[PDB]
Amino acid sequence: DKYRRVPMLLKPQQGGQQYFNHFLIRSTNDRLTQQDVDNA
Amino acid sequence: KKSLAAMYMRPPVTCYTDACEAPVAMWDGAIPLKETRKLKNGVPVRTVSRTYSHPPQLTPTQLSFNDINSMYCVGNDELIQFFPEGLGGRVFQTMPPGHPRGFLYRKETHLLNLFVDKVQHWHTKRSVLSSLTNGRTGFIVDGPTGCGKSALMCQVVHFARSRNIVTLYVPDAKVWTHGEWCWPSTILPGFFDAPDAARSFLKYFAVANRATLTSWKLRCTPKDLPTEQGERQPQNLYELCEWGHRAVAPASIDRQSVCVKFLMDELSEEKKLPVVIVVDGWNLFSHETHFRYPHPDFLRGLASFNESSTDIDLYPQELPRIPASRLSFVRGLNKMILSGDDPNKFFITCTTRDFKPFDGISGFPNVETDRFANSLDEYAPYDPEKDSHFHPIQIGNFDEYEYRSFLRFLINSGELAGLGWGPLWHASSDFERKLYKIGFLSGRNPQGVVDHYHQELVWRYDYQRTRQKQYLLKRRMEGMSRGA
Amino acid sequence: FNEFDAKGREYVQYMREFARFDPRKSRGNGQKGFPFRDAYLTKMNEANQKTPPPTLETIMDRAVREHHQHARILSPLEVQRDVGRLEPIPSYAGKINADRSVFPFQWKTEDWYEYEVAKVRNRRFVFENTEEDGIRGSEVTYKIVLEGFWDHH
Amino acid sequence: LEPCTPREWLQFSHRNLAYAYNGALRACHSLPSMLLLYKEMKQRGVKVDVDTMNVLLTRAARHEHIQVDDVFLLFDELVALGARPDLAAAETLHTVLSHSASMPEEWREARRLQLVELYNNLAMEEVERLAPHRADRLLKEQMKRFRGNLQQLGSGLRPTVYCRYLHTTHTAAVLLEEVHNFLWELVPNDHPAMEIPALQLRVPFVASVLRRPSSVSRAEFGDTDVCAVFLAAAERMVDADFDDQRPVSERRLFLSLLTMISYSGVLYTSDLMAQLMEMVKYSNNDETRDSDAQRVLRYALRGSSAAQDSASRTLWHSVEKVADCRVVGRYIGARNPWNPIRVCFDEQGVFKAYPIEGRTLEALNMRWDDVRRLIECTGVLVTPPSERCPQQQKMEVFTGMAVYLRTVATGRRYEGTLFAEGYDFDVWVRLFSLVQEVRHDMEKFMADHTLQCVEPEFECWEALLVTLRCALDFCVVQMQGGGARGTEREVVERLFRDVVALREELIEESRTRFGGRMRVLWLQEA
Amino acid sequence: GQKSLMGALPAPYGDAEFFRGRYRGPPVARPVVSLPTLH
Amino acid sequence: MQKLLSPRTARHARLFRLAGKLADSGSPGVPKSDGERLVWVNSHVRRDKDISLSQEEERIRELMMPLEVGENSFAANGQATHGNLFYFREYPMYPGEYVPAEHNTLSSLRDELRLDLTAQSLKEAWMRVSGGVYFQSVDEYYASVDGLDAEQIGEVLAALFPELNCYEAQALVQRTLECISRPVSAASRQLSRTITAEAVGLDNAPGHYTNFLEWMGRLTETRAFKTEHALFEFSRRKFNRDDVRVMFENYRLMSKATLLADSADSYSHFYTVLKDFARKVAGEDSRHQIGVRIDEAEVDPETGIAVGRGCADGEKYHFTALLRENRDHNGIITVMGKPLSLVLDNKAWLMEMVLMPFDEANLDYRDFDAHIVSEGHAMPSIANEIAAFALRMAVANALVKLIPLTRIPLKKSGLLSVDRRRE
Amino acid sequence: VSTGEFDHPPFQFRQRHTFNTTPLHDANRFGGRTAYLREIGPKKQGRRFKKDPRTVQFNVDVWCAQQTLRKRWKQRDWEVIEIPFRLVPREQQRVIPELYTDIPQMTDPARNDFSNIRNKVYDREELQGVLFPAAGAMLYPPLQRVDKQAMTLDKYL
RNA sequence: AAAUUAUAUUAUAUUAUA
Ligand SMILES: Nc1nc2c(ncn2[C@@H]2O[C@H](COP(=O)(O)OP(=O)(O)OP(=O)(O)O)[C@@H](O)[C@H]2O)c(=O)[nH]1
Ligand SMILES: [Mg+2]
């Protein structure tokens, strides 16, 4: 129907906010691992 | 991507538990495959194996102290051999014919296993067994609903029948007390019988303990029993139960009464052979069976209904309810319990809390959606210390070790047998998130653990795999940008 | 700002009332002598509650980190969650004892059914003029109920 | 903006005013306007951020008329206002400290100690922060940056954060690499070293730079400071399961750690040697751990693998005992009985071979007399009780004797044969008298030290019980399985009755005595 | 929107990464799965 | 034939020693028998092994994830109909998340501060030595020669600083010349980043290239250049209603005499209005994020209980959650005196919504106790999704009141957001 | 908390036996108690009450009250015996108020017994000296209570 | 020939024939 009374934060329902910092630290770890691979 | 499934070979099938493996295309991403390199006829030897293996199928003699809070399995042929009666109320909900037959070895399971191990030669360790039971005839196991009560009853029936001990197993007491119909006893005046449950018991106990009941000579049994043409008079206890349960209706209805009476008479005289008696739901044998006494106008006789001063056809009424001690089976049981001349029978029993809920108000139960449709209509409180002559053992819910082992067995052995997610492993979360969430939802209650393992299908608010696939797709895109 | 919001000021007052509750001092107060349904019926269920100790995995997980790892496990109210700021570490972080008779409130339904009927039937069972101290106690009580068509009138 | 309507009150917080004032503070170009903006920021209630401290320290370091004590006082004011120091502000303060020599030397040393404390706190904070993410490479780069920052400041990282960082590791390679880093942080770069080719590392001699008192105490030695980190690495190798793409064996990892410890000249402590031969005791290689226990026992008896025999080693042996009760107990529990190597030493030189599948009574009698001579010459029971070592730890010698008799009785280790086959009858009679001698010595030791709480633990009691069970099984297989031979058969039945009586006595004592701690041994074997 | 010159100024002292309270732009979205190709 | 009950590994023995130390210390919950401690140690080792197995199977499952649409892999996200509905960020959301800074920028800022302090010290040393005044003529400005030659600065750096590399010494000479000329501005490096040598046309003339770069850098950081950039961005429609209102408020603060004194200059009267807009325009160096609200904690100092609210259908569902910290790790949730598994009839899809505010916060539920009071319409069962939505909002508001930084993920998940749908 | 049905379905178009839809008068609803109120065909005083909403709501309220009563009476494992004040135990030697008169009274807050006196149930075997003085033959046996301090299977002995 | 305005949901009806 018309969901105009529903907020914009509820319509996609973007959950999973806990994993983002873990993903960023894993990305930094993989960048340093790639730097270790390129040097040797 | 990296499958490693065409290279995977099947390990050799040793038991029934190893044969319960699905095809490799099912559990390829559910149970992932690792590669190892051993040193035989070369430095690399690529051996692809599974990360998870099935729990070991162990004989009860092989179960030890280090197997506490571990998982073991029983063969399907051992399941047919040791349990012809059946299992508990909800024990067989986790064993379809494809699944392995798994059991958790708890601390109380280890205690009862050593107890049954000492029962097997009781005349040497009689003072030890007296100190264990505190002089009582046996143990009654109580706790909240959905714990390991009936599962431990099947476990101790397995322990007793694996060591060649004569074992009485009532897998559900609600077929006796809360049965289909009640009939008065033929030779016991003032007593009653549950005929169908007695026929099933006389069949299954005989085919369970045929190894020792054939060597059981009849001591106090009349030899002038009624016998049809071509049938042999019973000389053994197995022959007595075969005379009892194998008959044509309605001669079996009185044959079971005579057989239960003389079987309980023959049990009460044996003082040298240990007989373990396991009852699931002793709290139903300690109070009134749901049958009531008939109205005396049924047996008095009527000429007509208009002028006979009767109201059986006009209005219903609730007569006094029949207690369990008026059943001949429980009469023989209480005769063995209360008479102190039997230092031979060990009553390792438990209670059931399978009853319907009531929390102050109650509407009518919806017939489609009702988890308690086969539940008992009792609502009565129970105290095992005051309502039973046995020593009470309190079983609570799972600690995190037993819950972790049980959930690991459930998830991984359901995906290995081709009954879990399988190819759809990428939609459900990993095992740590599932353990955390099911430990929230169940409170580590074992029936709640099984119910929420089945209800994991309809989880709406898990966002782990979505963010993981976003991160992996982004990493793939930046890797392809690095390649360009 | 103030200290608490509207519903937060309500439930902090209910804890101060139950901390000084004495049932013999609820002599003729009426329904104002009823001692905060949530915390009162929790105490009546202590025969069923029976506050358990921490589990064997919890006391092992902490004592490994306390002794074998030389880094104590601190409570979630001790975690410095703000990066770039040091927090003044409030004193209720680990000092609140975990007892099931105190919190959380779980009760028998028969006591809750008896509480809710007794609180409404004893509404006007109040003795106004008591021989006591100030604003509660008096000798005569006058109530003048004014009625008009507008609320500012 | 101070909000007046409730719509703009719903977007008002001092933590967001932190970001607003940070952006406006970075928008300014000079410190005279910046300090006025900061003063009206801190006069208002505003949570002070790390960005405020970063921009203030940087754009006050580059201002011309600034004295550096005002920089450090501004840092003290910002950390007093609730701003967490990060690595950027710490490096800014280190740069301002390094470029200040007109200040007096006491001020420079005070600020240097403050920066040492700050870098160690930041190192411990990053260790605790990057631990659960399994970020060992990123944490390795952060610890390398902290080591580079502290070696420029004339110090190093503390062994407490090294013990924590070794206890939070996941891979063994970075574990040995960080032990290597701690060993090289003490000595300068031109120090002599020894090369380990299995790890491709160079471990340096550390005892030349460690502090030593040469009445004297344990804390005055710097060898405890290094053996704490050695013990942290040893305990990490015990409890944690390492994840590697090509996993190394436990024997190779233990031998590499042992050569890394031994090639440094550090004085060994008690619990390090105890943990090392505890790892030797529960090893799975039957043909290897005898020489490993022999090597770690030589290390504990000498006390240090230094080439020269110094008086500091004598002072270290006078302060504490590296040859304590736990290492003798775990050595006797780690040795094999039928090993042709001698159990005890001769004049501390070497553990020779035995002068004689020989399973005679004289062999095990020489083994047991060697064990008793070892316990006598180490003097572990005659040591006085102290605060660091209790009387309870000396029961481990009796546990080691009990595990020795267990490995005599049954043939296997911790991981129809009911006992060790190929024995004689007098072997089991001598074994039963040895069980009685161990029980008598343990009862005498408990009777002597009754005034403090002295209990036997589970391992010695279960070992004595399974030796009596193996002797019972040997007796019942020789009695009714012997073929009715008459060769001292009444002596076999007498030994069987004595084994049954002593076993029932031990089971009833496990049920009754010691407060019911060993009730499960009554529940199992009865 | 249209192309402008904002952000193109040289930032003083090069410390544009340590300011963690900086403007991060509008929240971008990413695909959770690669859709199949059209051709 | 007889399994030994004793600890078989060194890890088992170390855990048994820890359990014995705990039992001798008198901790609540630690068993007193030895068989129970043995069971505890064996179960903890099995739990550690199972955690290692889960970590290894997740490591293997990361590489075989079906990132494309296939046989069993379905999108169903509305990526075909709507397209890219789930957001994703590559930056740590301050101050909820933390990623450590890269070492290259750290070392660059460290070396820049070192060179700036060394050049300032050498400039102050020459100012003390030369004796005060130093006037620069027009030909001295066109020759770009200061009081010190490059040779004198190189000799001073070689004499005073022994450990100094060649290129570092040449960069120090260049920075001392730049600091003795004017106050140093770090603007030539970023102009070398954004403008290459082939674009302007100097490929064989590096010296004139660096001269043009430093001239453009010293002309960039003026007030007039910032004012012209602000006017250019005002012409390019890069402002919202908030910036228009702030420019109006800054115009209203100027009186007429200050307006005349500012219009005496050509760029200052525009700059007084456009200061905030030029702060916004300057990019990630000077524009701040708005960010979610971070409030103060409203916790009872005696009981430690925070109070949160939740609503649904306007009138029907109202709930109030009281939240406390459990220090014995036995946390449980209760709704109107009954535990959550019996209020919602063991339904996983309703109790997962109550679990979700602890999940998005990266918090353990067993460290918190919660009781939820129903204030709306009382019904015999609240086992529906809208009541569970109200329960989730109540638990999330209680978590926000207890720990304030929990508002940073919980507002991003939409758990603190109220919809207005009635019947 | 209970999840059974309490309200009656409202009046609308005549429902059919489809998916998510039951007829308005079915034998599955309310145990078939709608058989009194149904019309099988697809006298005004016997036809108007089957279509009134207040009538059918009152009838289902009566039936739910009957269900609540039979479930509350099936909970009873006791009976009320009028015992004099002298022979009663010490917890009942107080002034017990009537139902819904005062606060729900704890049993004994001094002896650490916080439970409702109205829910207290006493054993029959402990009151044989009070209930049966005329028999004198001990008609009920004494209740065997387990020794909590005895070393049994529960305590690893 | 696209954008979607589109509400959509399910049920009923007649002198079968009195
Ligand atoms: N295999 C196995 N399953 C177990 C074990 N313990 C609990 N369970 C599971 O827990 C559920 C509960 O089993 P029951 O013993 O019948 O539950 P209960 O305690 O008797 O509950 P009530 O019948 O209501 O009294 C079963 O369905 C099992 O699946 C165990 O030790 N081994
Ligand atoms: Mg059951």
Tab-separated table of N, CA and C and ligand atoms in Angstrom, chain B residues 88-91 145-151 171-172 280-281 350-354, ligand 2:
chain	number	residue	atom	x	y	z
B	88	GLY	N	11.109	-42.981	24.592
B	88	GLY	CA	10.343	-42.077	25.422
B	88	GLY	C	9.347	-41.235	24.637
B	89	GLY	N	8.887	-40.173	25.299
B	89	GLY	CA	7.830	-39.356	24.724
B	89	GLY	C	8.290	-38.528	23.539
B	90	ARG	N	9.513	-38.004	23.602
B	90	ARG	CA	10.043	-37.159	22.541
B	90	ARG	C	11.467	-37.544	22.162
B	91	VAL	N	11.893	-38.769	22.472
B	91	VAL	CA	13.273	-39.159	22.196
B	91	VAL	C	13.469	-39.427	20.709
B	145	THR	N	10.239	-29.778	32.465
B	145	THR	CA	9.829	-30.480	31.257
B	145	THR	C	10.865	-30.313	30.152
B	146	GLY	N	10.987	-31.341	29.319
B	146	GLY	CA	11.899	-31.280	28.201
B	146	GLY	C	13.351	-31.506	28.535
B	147	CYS	N	13.657	-31.994	29.733
B	147	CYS	CA	15.028	-32.292	30.116
B	147	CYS	C	15.404	-33.691	29.633
B	148	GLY	N	16.527	-34.208	30.109
B	148	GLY	CA	16.924	-35.545	29.725
B	148	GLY	C	16.395	-36.604	30.668
B	149	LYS	N	15.074	-36.683	30.826
B	149	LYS	CA	14.495	-37.701	31.697
B	149	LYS	C	14.232	-38.996	30.937
B	150	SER	N	13.383	-38.929	29.909
B	150	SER	CA	13.068	-40.120	29.128
B	150	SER	C	14.255	-40.558	28.283
B	151	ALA	N	15.096	-39.608	27.866
B	151	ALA	CA	16.331	-39.950	27.170
B	151	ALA	C	17.267	-40.740	28.072
B	171	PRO	N	7.878	-47.722	28.246
B	171	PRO	CA	8.396	-46.531	27.554
B	171	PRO	C	7.506	-45.313	27.693
B	172	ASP	N	6.213	-45.505	27.933
B	172	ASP	CA	5.280	-44.423	28.221
B	172	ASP	C	4.284	-44.961	29.232
B	280	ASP	N	9.078	-44.905	32.499
B	280	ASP	CA	9.059	-43.509	32.078
B	280	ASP	C	7.754	-42.893	32.563
B	281	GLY	N	7.853	-41.955	33.500
B	281	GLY	CA	6.670	-41.318	34.041
B	281	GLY	C	6.068	-42.055	35.219
B	350	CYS	N	11.571	-42.425	36.313
B	350	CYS	CA	11.539	-40.975	36.231
B	350	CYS	C	10.088	-40.520	36.183
B	351	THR	N	9.903	-39.208	36.115
B	351	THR	CA	8.592	-38.595	35.984
B	351	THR	C	8.448	-37.963	34.608
B	352	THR	N	7.235	-37.513	34.318
B	352	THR	CA	6.958	-36.754	33.111
B	352	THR	C	6.212	-35.480	33.474
B	353	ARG	N	6.531	-34.402	32.768
B	353	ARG	CA	5.850	-33.122	32.906
B	353	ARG	C	5.239	-32.715	31.574
B	354	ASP	N	4.658	-33.692	30.881
B	354	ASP	CA	4.130	-33.547	29.531
B	354	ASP	C	2.763	-32.865	29.503
I	2	MG	MG	9.446	-37.574	29.216
